[PDB]
Design brief:
Keywords: Chromophore, Luminescence, Photoprotein. By secondary structure, the protein is α+β, with helices and mostly antiparallel strands. 35% of the residues lie in helices and 29% in strands. The chain folds into 2 domains: 1-227, Green Fluorescent Protein (Beta Barrel); 228-398, no CATH class. The chain has an 11-stranded mixed β-barrel with strand order 1-2-3-11-10-7-8-9-4-5-6. Strand 1 (13-23) and strand 2 (26-37) form a beta hairpin. Helix 3 (246-259) crosses helix 4 (261-270) and helix 9 (331-344) packs across helix 10 (346-356). The longest helix is centred in the middle third of the chain and has 14 residues, at 246-259. The protein is elongated, with a radius of gyration of 31 Å. It starts with 12 loop residues before the first strand and ends with a helix. The chain binds ligand PGT, dodecane (6 copies) and chloride ion (2 copies).
Length: 398
């Protein structure tokens, strides 16, 4: 946890919105309620105009009507100012310019009152063309996707935000609305001041088919981005698995293990005492240890994997298993990803170099000299597995 405020958003939260506004002197009030869930970066709000008719289009109000509900990924959690200002909350102020038309100025307080997150807003519009897209109610009822750009304002102990909303017009044109935003802590407690990043925002406007009153149902999905997480061998591994249909493979293996005698025999051999001698002797090698530690320090849980290691079938025996898995793997692609990571990943190249090191090859040579290992290979060659070919293929990668 990177802040105390952050812990308030783990679950679903009640939301309340109140707005008072005046646009070209048309005065109105709106109230809304719903729930945010910041884990998923979702929120759901319903609004009603309590004064009678809304003098401006619902879509123009969307941005005005709780960014503390964005989903920040774990690597970005030190960059979330919004949750960090909670519960005391923050002031969010904006100027919104509608191209070729009037502008909105807004001031909102966002903060908890009890268990509820409350957004109270005052809004003033001016200089609107009476025949324009806004007063003329020419906007389609819908919303688009936008990136919301955040940067720290140190002087103000807060953030500066800007973005451009695209409002679709009924004649197929687009009405731009340039947003300039600042957010300020209400409380005197410490807050996170983020590096430059953005919120990816998606929204959808709908109705309650039952609701008779003019209303807007608003659905928002918001996720922070624009800052790369630190990378290591985990991330490289995940990338190879990504290329691999692991579900199919795990199933095929499961099947052979169930219905095939030879596959079961080889598994029995894995708990065999001859095989035990092999594991034991390798585990005894200091250079094997160093290699494991190396993997550990670079993001791999290695020891965890090894110590913790204990009908689609188209084929028969070990070769049947090997062939079925192979038919599945994208060899050319994996091989490409492998070549690429030697270029683009430092950790992966160190890993490669580590394996090619004299230290490591001596682990390999120790193994090659175990007659119990040499016997294991012969046990396979006689079951039809071409080990020598497979062995050469691997030598050739390195
Ligand atoms: C998390 C797993 C850790 C397991 C550690 C396993 C210990 C390694 C034991 C080696 C496996 C034996 C497989 C035999 C392959 C061919 C060996 C060989 O004679 O050739 C080498 C072939 O190259 C290798 O060194 C094989 C590397 C084995 C891959 C083990 C890496 C584990 C990856 C973890 C991620 C060197 O080639 P050369 O042309 O320079 O001579
Ligand atoms: C072949 C490797 C498949 C990975 C399954 C975990
Ligand atoms: C206990 C950690 C040692 C792991 C050694 C694995 C040896 C695998 C050899 C298999 C040869 C095909
Ligand atoms: C299962 C453990 C594999 C160790 C590396 C051997 C590659 C053949
Ligand atoms: C080629 C690899 C054949 C063995 C696949 C076993 C996968 C088990 C998970
Ligand atoms: C994990 C790395 C697999 C490399 C794939 C090379 C295929 C030949
Ligand atoms: C095939 C085994 C290669 C493992 C990848 C090492 C880097
Ligand atoms: Cl401003
Ligand atoms: Cl105002």
């Amino acid at each position: 946890h990177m802040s105390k405020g952050e812990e308030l958003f783990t679950g679903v939260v009640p939301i309340l919105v109140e707005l008072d506004g005046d646009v070209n002197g048309h005065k109105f009030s709106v109230s809304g309620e719903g729930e945010g869930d910041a884990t998923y970066g979702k929120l759901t709000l319903k609004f009603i105009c309590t004064t009678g008719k809304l003098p401006v289009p619902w879509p123009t109000l969307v941005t005005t009507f709780v960014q503390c509900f964005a989903r920040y990924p774990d690597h970005m959690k030190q960059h979330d100012f919004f949750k960090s200002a909670m519960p005391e909350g923050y002031v969010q102020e904006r100027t919104i310019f509608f191209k070729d038309d009037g502008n909105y100025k807004t001031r909102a307080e966002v903060k908890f009152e009890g268990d509820t997150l409350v957004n109270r807003i005052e809004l003033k519009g001016i200089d609107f063309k009476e025949d324009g897209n806004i007063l003329g109610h020419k906007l389609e009822y819908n919303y688009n996707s936008h990136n919301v750009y955040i940067m720290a304002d140190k002087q103000k102990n807060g953030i500066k935000v800007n973005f451009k909303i695209r409002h679709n017009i009924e004649d197929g044109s687009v009405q731009l609305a340039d947003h300039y935003q600042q957010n300020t802590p209400i409380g005197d407690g410490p807050v996170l001041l983020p590096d430059n990043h953005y919120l990816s925002t998606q929204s959808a406007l709908s109705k309650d088919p039952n609701e008779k009153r003019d209303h807007m149902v608003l659905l928002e999905f918001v996720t922070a981005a624009g800052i790369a997480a630190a990378r290591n061998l985990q991330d490289d591994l995940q990338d190879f698995l990504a290329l691999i249909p692991v579900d199919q493979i795990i199933a095929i293996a499961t099947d052979y293990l169930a219905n095939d005698a030879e596959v079961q025999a080889a598994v029995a051999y894995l708990q065999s005492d001859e095989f035990e001698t092999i594991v034991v002797a390798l585990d005894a090698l200091p250079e094997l240890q160093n290699f494991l530690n190396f993997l550990e320090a670079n993001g791999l849980n290695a020891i965890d994997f090894l110590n913790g290691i204990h009908h689609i079938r188209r084929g028969v025996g070990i070769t049947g298993l090997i062939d079925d898995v192979l038919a599945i793997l994208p060899i050319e692609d994996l091989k490409a990803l492998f070549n690429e990571k030697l270029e683009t990943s430092p950790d992966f190249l160190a890993l490669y170099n580590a394996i090619r090191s004299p230290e490591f090859q001596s682990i390999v040579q120790t193994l090659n000299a175990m007659p119990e290992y040499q016997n294991l290979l012969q046990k396979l060659r006689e079951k039809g597995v071409d080990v020598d070919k497979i062995i050469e293929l691997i030598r050739a990668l390195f």
